[PDB]
Design a protein around this ligand. Structure first.
Ligand SMILES: [Fe+3]
Length: 315
């Protein structure tokens, strides 16, 4: 009755403040396990006696590995059912989106560039000018997976090769390192999540993070077609010892107060309507979402990852 356990790939500073707010509101302690990756391996290796209640990812692919991997159970909740859009959830409560995010182009603030198509990143004119993290990170495999859904595996492999040839340094680091390396003059552009820009641009003045943020502007590419969007999402673990408290945490996270935190503290987009965005995030302009369902993007996640490997993307 007294606690709940969260296993997640989320950044602690990007989830802790609303677990704190939940505990302070509910009286329910949130035990916490953060993981770089391998969420399915840890949950399945712990077996029947696993303490896991809630499993939280920052990628639909990752989320569906868990559902289709047999380590989840269905959720029955009128609140999640009424609040979360039917295009951003699993059938009969198998999984739910909690926030939205878009993978966009970081651009040196003074570069002339109003528009971008995702395909443009392969264009030879960007040679030696692109920064990106590992092509095997879920943010990217999902993006690659959507491109497979739009253009086929042949065109996607070709794009990956063009992108790899355009890279200014090795595909590694995190999303923030794109803004860093743009400030350092290593690259002029790079693919990364816009919510980090909101996080960096609001950072303490004088800090590196702040300088990175003030170096760049956001350009949202479209598919040659809207901007690619992914989710943070959760499922309840198959043998959750605290299922009721697990559902309570998820219901709390889709509430207006918590979705405000997603907007104003995480700089993401809420799944719930009527929540105001952060002023900096609002300044990127209106978001035109890719029509492709997130569950459809997940279809090609495995092929996406093989293609990234095939081209030796991180070499
Ligand atoms: Fe993230």
């Amino acid at each position: 009755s007294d606690e709940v356990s969260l296993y997640t790939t989320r950044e602690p500073k990007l989830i802790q403040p609303l677990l704190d707010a939940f505990a302070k509101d509910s009286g329910i302690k949130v035990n916490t396990v953060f993981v770089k990756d391998g969420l399915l391996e840890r949950v399945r290796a712990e077996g029947d006696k696993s303490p896991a209640d809630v499993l939280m990812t920052v990628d639909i692919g990752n989320l569906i590995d868990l559902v289709n991997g047999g380590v989840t159970q269905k959720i029955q909740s009128q609140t999640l059912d009424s609040v979360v859009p039917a295009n951003l959830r699993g059938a009969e409560g198998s999984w739910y989106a909690l926030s939205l995010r878009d993978r966009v182009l970081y651009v040196e603030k003074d570069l002339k560039l109003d528009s971008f198509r995702y395909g443009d990143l392969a264009d030879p004119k960007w040679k030696g000018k692109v920064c990106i993290r590992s092509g095997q990170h879920p943010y990217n495999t999902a993006l690659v997976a959507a491109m497979i859904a739009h253009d086929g595996a042949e065109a996607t492999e070709k794009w990956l090769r063009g992108v790899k040839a355009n890279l200014a340094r090795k595909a590694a680091g995190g999303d923030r390192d794109v803004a860093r390396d743009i400030l350092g003059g290593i690259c002029d552009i790079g693919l990364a999540n816009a919510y980090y820009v909101g996080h960096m641009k609001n950072a303490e003045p004088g800090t590196d993070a702040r300088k990175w943020g003030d170096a760049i502007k956001v350009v949202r590419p479209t598919f040659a077609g809207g901007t690619h969007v992914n989710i943070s999402g959760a499922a309840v673990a198959a043998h959750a010892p605290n299922k009721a408290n697990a559902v309570k945490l998820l219901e709390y996270l889709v509430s207006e107060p918590a979705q405000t935190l997603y907007a104003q503290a995480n700089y993401e987009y809420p799944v719930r309507a009527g929540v105001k965005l952060d002023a900096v995030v609002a300044s990127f302009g209106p978001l035109k979402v890719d029509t492709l369902p997130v569950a459809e993007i997940a279809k090609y996640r495995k092929q996406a990852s093989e293609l990234v490997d095939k081209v030796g993307f991180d070499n």
